[PDB]
């Protein structure tokens, strides 16, 4: 699959909302080509801005 693709926090948040508040980091990294640690990094920034409440 694809590697080192970059997305914005807004794109990830929009994806999450559109995906019913669900994110499979493995699947997402595979399909959209974003590194797993980059997805984690973006989630942390969303969490620290109080924009998302992470579960499971």
């Amino acid at each position: 699959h694809h590697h080192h693709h970059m997305i914005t926090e807004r794109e990830l948040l929009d994806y999450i909302v559109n995906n019913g508040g669900f994110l499979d980091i493995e699947h997402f990294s595979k399909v959209y080509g974003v590194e797993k640690q980059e997805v984690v990094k973006l989630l942390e920034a969303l969490k620290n801005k109080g924009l998302i409440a992470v579960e499971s």
Partner: peptide, 13 residues
């Protein structure tokens, strides 16, 4: 202060 959107996140490791 935004209302936090709930997100279930899996397969993080």
């Amino acid at each position: 202060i935004p209302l936090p959107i709930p997100v279930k996140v899996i397969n993080t490791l």
